[PDB]
Amino acid sequence: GSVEKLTADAELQRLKNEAAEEAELERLKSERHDHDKKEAERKALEDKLADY
Numbered sequence: 440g441s442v443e444k445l446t447a448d449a450e451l452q453r454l455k456n457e458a459a460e461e462a463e464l465e466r467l468k469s470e471r472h473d474h475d476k477k478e479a480e481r482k483a484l485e486d487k488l489a490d491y
Contacts, residue, residue: 467473
């Protein structure tokens with residue numbers, strides 16, 4: 440047992456910072472890229488099948 444105890448204490452702080460991980464998902468939503476895909480759904484009615 441020595442000052443090394445404080446070193447392991449740093450890992451405990453990271454666990455309490457797990458909350459920030461959820462905020463990461465919100466950042467992806469800012470892209471709006473996934474939302475843009477919804478408009479493409481309307482084009483699906485055309486059945487152009489340009490892909491193949």
